[PDB]
Design a protein around this ligand. Structure first.
Ligand SMILES: [Mg+2]
Ligand SMILES: [Mg+2]
Ligand SMILES: [Mg+2]
Ligand SMILES: [Mg+2]
Ligand SMILES: [Mg+2]
Ligand code: NA
Ligand code: NA
Ligand code: NA
Ligand code: NA
Ligand code: NA
Lengths: 1011, 204
């Protein structure tokens, strides 16, 4: 019947969806969420055989093991075991678009397992098998007999096996199809894999059982009182002696308990639900749940007889919180939220899409430690443990239906088609039925990038109808359709409109006030983090804080979707689209996370942490004003450390306890500070420290910081008259300056400093020359390709203008001797096709102190695309261990992404001055630097710089980081100016005007000397 | 202005004068100005100016040079934004072109005297036998900034000897969102800390 090519058949003999069950036969166990002997895990070693198509599967496989089969671990994605290749495609479907058909060559994975079942499980009750996740469709057999079928790769499919099992050994056979009509609703931008990638378990339930239960919490006006309402449903034989008891606990303290026989209130002309009952429990002064303070209660649901015999018990963690939209604002417990969120795909560099507790906990800790309070399940229901962790650790969750049809044309071709409504409805309804009791879930999403169809409006209303406790959002069709309670655009900019036809992305500030608009705005996706990105992140947060209805967004995204591969020598390396022979593919577009696949932070993560801080600061004289952005908690685990330093040299510091109420302020007056002796700029740095450890952080954790320039005393003292005077030697080929053990060689043909000597040791491997280009960042490239060039992308504009091929034409090179120094004057023209792009005019002044002052003045043709940078570069002959500098750091920072960096004296091993982006590009820049020390060299001024063993040329010509080779010496790039990196999105120019080098004329000066 | 340095050097085809000044008040260094004057065999004087502004001092109204010329000419010819008075935050209406007006038009008769007549984005200025070239803002009139500041009514202003010239590498915005509180937007305040501009003074 080819059920996998029929959207009308999404399952066969599958049991109803429901909240997590464990069927405890002991109430204390249910209260403490301890393991249940009735819920068995079937994870572990299974038998597996790969086939090119279901027609290739031998009928013998149903009755017994295939000798050809291998023993593999389950859960897993069979691509991770190397049976076939994982495919990385963004929008374009991995299969020919011909709904509801899939390729005849359909990779088929045959899983089997021989397992034991005790007769006690079969003598009474019901035994069901639970598949938490099977990608993308499968048929199930037990002991050779067909059981059922199921689709939707991200929700559990359960089947009753009571009539198929026997005491002792039993064998399951699962035929998993890689492609199915379900694949048409699973076009998410991620690796396309398959298999039994989530847990498999067996659950025993009594015949008379709890088949479902919904927990809800209502409050009075000030949240000082609440009522917990628990609707319980049963299956099996109704008996007057049956009872349901619901008890609520706060730790080991029982807060409330209620008991009642089955029989619900009258519903309509035919009566009510004889198989249901609703318990209502009053709770005075409830401890409220929030991401700030994840207070949780435990609700235990007991099904028992009047005489007191327990039949079975179920339970869940309960978080008392109200979520509602009022007067245009999304409120949690009556307070307006500020969503510091991120989109998070379920991805592991080694295990593919199989999630484990350790990885989940690690992600959550990193998120909270970096000031994130919310996560969007892009773009499907997650592993069930994810919600439990978010409930307990405290994170707001957007639960999203597994529906994405991005590849359709138009995007809503299937979602506006009534014939696909059934399939879509199951993806939404079964998600709600499964996760509705989790307090962490505060918003339901109808899916992602599937246009806007009538099916969306229908399902939007279904959710509003069945669960009025949570708002529903959906971005498809313009981000503000009738299917969303929240304006949730993706990549809409702060001030710039992008008036696309039909689905425009208005400036978020403008969007809010469009005629008749009243809803809150929270970006479902923003700040695309591809490689060296997040430029302009501060601009979003300034807007979020100033506009009440701009309530945040979810960054795109958490982790790079890179996979590990091994070279000829067995060494591991990060691979992306196309590295598995997969084609077509979208190469490196699968990597745009704030952290590498192994969870190591990208530099951009700290920018996010700083901008998402929960404490705001203002300075006025000696008074520091601390304002709390917390909505519910007092600062009961925070103290403020302050430090005043003169050009990196500490002069004073101290610490004051923070005692600020949510939304409150605290004034802190700094002690009378003694005036410094030497000249320089005094800097004030404050940081909030958490003295005590928490569930998500260690003692001493820094949660926020800020800096201010205090008094500055300009140096007005002149340097003592030098002893010696530099000697100039003029030859037809060079201008040589000599002073003591130092020598400078200027080539008169090139007009550049070609060599410098300290003693008899050469200091340069490559002359010191102007540089106006950079190895293109992901944002500079966009979607441009050699086969499909995007003339609008920055990299293409630079290439077309000849920025990368420009040659220096010497216009002037002269030498002059002064009373105490030698002055070399040069002028160069960079041309391409007879076009003068840039003109650099310089003067080098070498005086008796051995210092070389370089003054640079550049002209940039107003009609050439603004250059990526304006500076100098050279390859130093030396390689040192440390890099010391007075400036912004310690991490990588660019003009439009340097708010998190702090001005101070930093010292790091050379290696930390290089950022290992999987896709090589300009990196490691540090801005606002007044002094740089490397080996025997020191550079002073006011510049930006990067230093590493990789030339810009190599970074630009290398596709993967593991292919980079350290070059001889050290490449130094010192810029007077550097273009922003952008990142509002990665398919169009996103560098704001104020961060583009458009002045036309630029000036900077550097002093080079021996440290 | 406290003088910190003033040297003279003779080059292959020119004379180079280098100076350094520090403007102080109550022992506080407000601004430091470093310059070089290069006079070549063609009679042109190239002036390079580099200024440091203490970060803790209120951002300055302008950063430039001024002097009282001995001559009084009838016309002012310039290649820049014009023809009317324009400032950094009020120059959108002005157009870049070659303008030529009588001296009086380079002065705006505001009833209450103040800085006025500025023209921005100017690459060349011509007055009498003088010619200034670069990328600066300037105003030129028979009234000193001092007189303008000390005179309450325009009718009480008297033309001074010669002509007062104010050439700025940079000039602060004039603001105006209201007139009882600071209204010059951040992007138009001179808060960069370090400023650079260059001019060539010659005779034509
Ligand atoms: Mg089907
Ligand atoms: Mg047997
Ligand atoms: Mg998509
Ligand atoms: Mg800051
Ligand atoms: Mg205009
Ligand atoms: Na807001
Ligand atoms: Na991507
Ligand atoms: Na505290
Ligand atoms: Na590259
Ligand atoms: Na006046």
């Amino acid at each position: 019947r080819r059920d996998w090519e029929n959207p009308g058949v999404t399952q066969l003999n599958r049991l109803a969806a429901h909240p997590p069950f464990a069927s405890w036969r002991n109430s204390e166990e249910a209260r403490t969420d301890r393991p249940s002997q009735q819920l068995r895990s079937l994870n572990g070693e299974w038998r597996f055989a790969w086939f090119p198509a279901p027609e290739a599967v031998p009928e013998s496989w149903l009755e017994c093991d295939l000798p050809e089969a291998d023993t593999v671990v389950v859960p897993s994605n069979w691509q991770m075991h190397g049976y076939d290749a994982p495919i990385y495609t963004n929008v374009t479907y991995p299969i020919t678009v011909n709904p509801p058909f899939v390729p005849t060559e359909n990779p088929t994975g045959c899983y089997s397992l021989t397992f034991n079942v005790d007769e006690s499980w079969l003598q009474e009750g019901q035994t069901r098998i639970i598949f938490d996740g099977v990608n993308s469709a499968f048929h199930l057999w037990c002991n050779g007999r067909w059981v059922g079928y199921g689709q939707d790769s991200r929700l559990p499919s359960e089947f009753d096996l009571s009539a198929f099992l026997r005491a002792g050994e039993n064998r399951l056979a699962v035929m998993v199809l890689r492609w199915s009509d379900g694949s048409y609703l699973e076009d998410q931008d991620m690796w396309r894999m398959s298999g039994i990638f989530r847990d498999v378990s067996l659950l025993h339930k009594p015949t008379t059982q709890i088949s479902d239960f919904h927990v809800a919490t209502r409050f009075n006006d000030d949240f000082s009182r609440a009522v917990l309402e628990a609707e319980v449903q049963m299956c099996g034989e109704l008996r007057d002696y049956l009872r349901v008891t619901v008890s609520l606990w706060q730790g080991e303290t029982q807060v409330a308990s209620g008991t009642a026989p089955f029989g619900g209130e009258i519903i309509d002309e035919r009566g009510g639900y004889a198989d249901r009952v609703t318990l209502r429990l009053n709770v005075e002064n409830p401890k409220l749940w929030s991401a700030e303070i994840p207070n949780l209660y435990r609700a235990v649901v007991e099904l028992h007889t009047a005489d007191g015999t327990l039949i079975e018990a179920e339970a869940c963690d309960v978080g008392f919180r109200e979520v509602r939209i009022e007067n245009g604002l999304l409120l949690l417990n009556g307070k307006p939220l500020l969503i510091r969120g991120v989109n998070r795909h379920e991805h592991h560099p080694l295990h593919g899409q199989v999630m484990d507790e350790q990885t989940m906990v690690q992600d959550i800790l990193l998120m909270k430690q970096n000031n994130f309070n919310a996560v969007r399940c892009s773009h499907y229901p997650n592993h069930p443990l994810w919600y439990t962790l978010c409930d307990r650790y405290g994170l707001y969750v957007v639960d999203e239906a597994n529906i994405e049809t991005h590849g359709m044309v138009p995007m809503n071709r299937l979602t506006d088609d009534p014939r696909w409504l059934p399939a879509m409805s199951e993806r939404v309804t079964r998600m709600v039925q499964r996760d509705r009791n989790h307090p962490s879930v505060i918003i339901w999403s109808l899916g992602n990038e599937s246009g806007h169809g009538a099916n969306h409006d229908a399902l939007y209303r279904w959710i509003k109808s069945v669960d009025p406790s949570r708002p529903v959002q959906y971005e498809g069709g313009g981000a503000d359709t009738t299917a969303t309670d929240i304006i949730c655009p993706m990549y809409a900019r702060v001030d710039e409109d992008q008036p696309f036809p039909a689905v425009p992305k208005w400036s978020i500030k403008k969007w809010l006030s469009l005629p008749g608009e009243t809803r809150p705005l929270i970006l479902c996706e923003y700040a695309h983090a591809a490689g060296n990105s997040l430029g302009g992140f501060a601009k979003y947060w300034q807007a979020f804080r100033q506009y009440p209805r701009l309530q945040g967004g979810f960054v795109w995204d958490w982790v790079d979707q890179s996979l590990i591969k091994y070279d000829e020598n067995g060494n591991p390396w990060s691979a992306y689209g196309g590295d598995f022979g997969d084609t077509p593919n979208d190469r490196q577009f699968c990597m745009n996370g704030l952290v590498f696949a192994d969870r190591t932070p990208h530099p951009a993560l700290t920018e996010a942490k700083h901008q998402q801080q929960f404490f705001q600061f203002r300075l006025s004289g000696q008074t520091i004003e601390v304002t709390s952005e917390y909505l519910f908690r007092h600062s009961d685990n925070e103290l403020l450390h302050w430090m005043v330093a003169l050009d990196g040299k500490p002069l004073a510091s101290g610490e004051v306890p923070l005692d600020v109420a949510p939304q409150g302020k605290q004034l802190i007056e700094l002690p009378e500070l003694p005036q410094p002796e030497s000249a320089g700029q005094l800097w004030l740095t404050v940081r909030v420290v958490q003295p005590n450890a928490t569930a998500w952080s260690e003692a001493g954790h820094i949660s926020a910081w800020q800096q201010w320039r205090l008094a500055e005393n300009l140096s007005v003292t002149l340097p003592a008259a030098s002893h010696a005077i530099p000697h100039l030697t003029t030859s037809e080929m060079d201008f040589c300056i000599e002073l003591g053990n130092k020598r400078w060689q200027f080539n008169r043909q090139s007009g550049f400093l070609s060599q410098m000597w300290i003693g008899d040791k050469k200091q340069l491997l490559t002359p010191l020359r102007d540089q106006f280009t950079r190895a293109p960042l992901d944002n500079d490239i966009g979607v441009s390709e050699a086969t499909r060039i995007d003339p609008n992308a920055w990299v293409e504009r630079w290439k077309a203008a000849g920025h990368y091929q420009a040659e220096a034409a010497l216009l002037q090179c002269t030498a002059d001797t002064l009373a105490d120094a030698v002055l070399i004057t040069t002028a160069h023209a960079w041309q391409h096709q007879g076009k003068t792009l840039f003109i650099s005019r310089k003067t080098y002044r070498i005086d008796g102190s051995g210092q070389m002052a370089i003054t640079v003045d550049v002209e940039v043709a107003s009609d050439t695309p603004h250059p990526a940078r304006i500076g100098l570069n050279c390859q130093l002959a030396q390689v040192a261990e440390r890099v010391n500098w007075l400036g912004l750091g310690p991490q990588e920072n660019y003009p439009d992404r340097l708010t998190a960096a702090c001005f101070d004296r930093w010292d790091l091993p050379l290696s930390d001055m290089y950022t290992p982006y999987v896709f090589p590009s300009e990196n490691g820049l540090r801005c606002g630097t007044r002094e740089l020390n490397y080996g025997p060299h020191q550079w002073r001024g006011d510049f930006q710089f990067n230093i590493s063993r990789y030339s810009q040329q190599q970074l630009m010509e290398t596709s993967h980081r593991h292919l980079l080779h350290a070059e001889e010496g050290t490449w130094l790039n010192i810029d007077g100016f550097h273009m922003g990196i952008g990142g509002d999105d990665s398919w169009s120019p996103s560098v704001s005007a104020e961060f583009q080098l458009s002045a036309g004329r630029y000036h900077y000066q550097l002093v080079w000397c021996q440290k």
